């Protein structure tokens, strides 16, 4: 679970991401596709080349969903209900892959916000991404 | 294990710029903060209760330097990771009883730290090579458990 | 999460365990110590030989806590709050070890209740033990 | 990998009593029911929607038999698991893209199924040996990913 202190950290850190959430989401996906090539299997319909428009558009949707989650930390199951259905029932994403994207998102935040990516902030964001991952795999 | 010649050269070129003390100290400190059950192995280091205590603890910095130095030995012997880490694999299994999942956790923390230190120079392609290195090291440290 | 159908299955299956919960808990621990020798590190103070009295007593406490949980499926965080503190703050049990004990408990139930350990029941019990494990590691 | 002579003999003696079709069919069926994301790999088998459909599906039984037969080859070649599974490791990585975590999941399901079939004969000591076998197989199938 997220403590009050973790919630404060997550909201603070995401305020520093601000308008870059979609660009970070896109870079995190690129890092994941290159680092962990088994994840490419879920995107047969995408052009996965560097700076692909479909990767940029998908990164935007991922970034916006994380922004939504940061607004709904007291009710993630409610806010992300429709995404839980999509990832479990339709897409059947292996739960391992959420760990991989989480790692790639932390890596991307480290690149762009090195002064703000403190140990305490890293810890809170890790818990946040785990809580999001738990919700998105909850309907198995 | 499986790197091209050009990937190998990029990995080694970054390692030339790694300060083992600063990166090591940070990597181990972040493991202890982010994954607090890992603190069970380091009771002899003293106060690991809060983030401030962990990151300033001199035993954390010194141990992190040791760990990173050893990682560096792996980076210079990528064709013989099992041989390089055989003695350490025994130590971690027989003497310390570290679950091998924790090697993968430390490897990923190290990648996050390299990202933080190198910024846009730690490209997606360079990260991908480092992921193969850290998985190679983790597997070599796990070798004498199973 | 546990659906209504999973809750029904779990309560039904545990009614068949009945008075054997403590003996199953003890055997699951023995299976775990032999199968996964790194888990022995947490019990330096125990005699871990076959039919050790301390293993039998501990198996009883584990079995009783699972029985408690089966009674409180709508509020596991509340019922197991004190155990969350013990496993996270005092014992610092690596989360990996809960998976190992869960497996050993399923193995033990398979041994003793082969006709009742159906695929649907296996699935519900796995989710239950995961939910218990999540609660016991929640205070990290 | 690391079994005594007496452990090896107990493992092989149990395998003499394994019906590969019944155990295989059950093991694969239980994987698909318990870990429903694994159903993504078997869309060609038809209806895997509910437990009844999975356990009675003839393609599930036939595939489970194949898998278990291959496991059996491993049980008879414990000194050369990497050689026995090299071709299958390639298939699973390059052609099927199965995350290796799923090999460990199937191995553990198989242990649960052996428990169910053999009862009190599947002693804690015999389970411990089988855990080393299933981890040995899982590692050999993972070999050509990293
Ligand atoms: C924090 C983690 C994640 C978030 C917040 C997230 C969010 C989303 C969103 C918002 C959508 C679009 C839904 C729509 O347009 O209706 C989506 C679709 C999808 N996600 Fe996820 N996702 C996550 C993780 C993953 C992972 C780990 C995978 C697989 C490796 C994955 C695979 C997909 C796929 C294949 C689609 C459909 C894309 C398309 O067809 O256009 N997702 N996700
Ligand atoms: C890439 C991964 C790792 C590498 C390269 C590594 C390397 C080392 C090395 C070089 C030593 C010193 C041995 C000596 O002085 O002879 C050591 C000791 C130790 N390592 Fe690891 N290690 C790794 C991961 C871990 C992890 C994840 C943990 C715990 C969660 C751990 C816990 C320890 C402990 C407790 C010691 C003994 C410290 C002492 O005596 O003061 N190591 N490791
Ligand atoms: C479903 C999982 C688990 C349950 C329900 C559970 C439950 C309990 C209970 C009820 C106690 C006794 C508390 C008391 O007397 O105050 C306890 C203690 C303990 N547990 Fe857990 N436990 C679980 C998993 C684990 C695991 C995975 C480990 C480590 C591998 C572990 C290690 C311990 C230890 C070392 C103690 C203290 C024993 C003593 O000193 O007497 N537990 N647990
Ligand atoms: C102990 C673990 C495993 C063993 C020994 C094993 C063995 C095999 C074997 C012998 C084949 C047949 C190859 C052929 O016909 O040449 C195969 C195919 C296959 N395996 Fe695995 N397997 C394992 C784990 C898994 C897991 C966990 C999954 C999925 C989650 C998987 C998915 C498949 C699929 C989709 C095929 C192709 C089926 C087809 O063509 O009809 N396997 N495996």
Author numbering:
A (entry chain A), C (entry chain A): 1 to 140
B (entry chain B), D (entry chain B): 1 to 146
Please quote the paper that reports this structure:
Hemoglobin (Hb) is an iron-containing heme protein that is essential for oxygen transport. The protein is an assembly of four globular subunits, each containing a heme B (protoporphyrin IX group; Hsia, 1998). Equine hemoglobin was among the first protein structure to be solved at high resolution. It is a useful model system for oxygen-sensitive metalloproteins due to its ubiquity and its high but reversible affinity for oxygen.
We have developed a fixed-target method that ‘sandwiches’ oxygen-sensitive crystals in between silicon nitride (SiN) chips, protecting them from ambient oxygen. Using crystals of DeoxyHb, we demonstrate the practicality of this design for anaerobic SSX, and further verify using UV–Vis and X-ray spectroscopy that the hemoglobin crystals remain in the deoxy state. The most noticeable movement is at the β-heme, where a water molecule is bound in MetHb compared with the empty β-heme in DeoxyHb. To establish the consistency of the method, crystallographic data were collected from a total of five chips, and all four chips that gave sufficiently complete data exhibited the presence of the deoxy state. All five chips with DeoxyHb that were also independently processed exhibited the presence of the deoxy state, with the exception of chip 3 that contained a bubble following the preparation, resulting in too few indexed images for a separate analysis. The doses of the first XANES scan and of the crystallographic measurements were similar (70 and 40 kGy, respectively), and both showed the presence of the deoxy form. As demonstrated by a combination of XANES, UV–Vis absorption spectroscopy and X-ray crystallography experiments, the described method slows down reoxidation of the hemoglobin to a level that allows data collection within a reasonable time frame for oxygen-sensitive samples. The XANES data showed that the hemoglobin crystals stayed in the deoxy form for at least 40 min. The β-heme of MetHb moves downwards to the proximal side of the heme pocket. Both structures are in agreement with published structures.
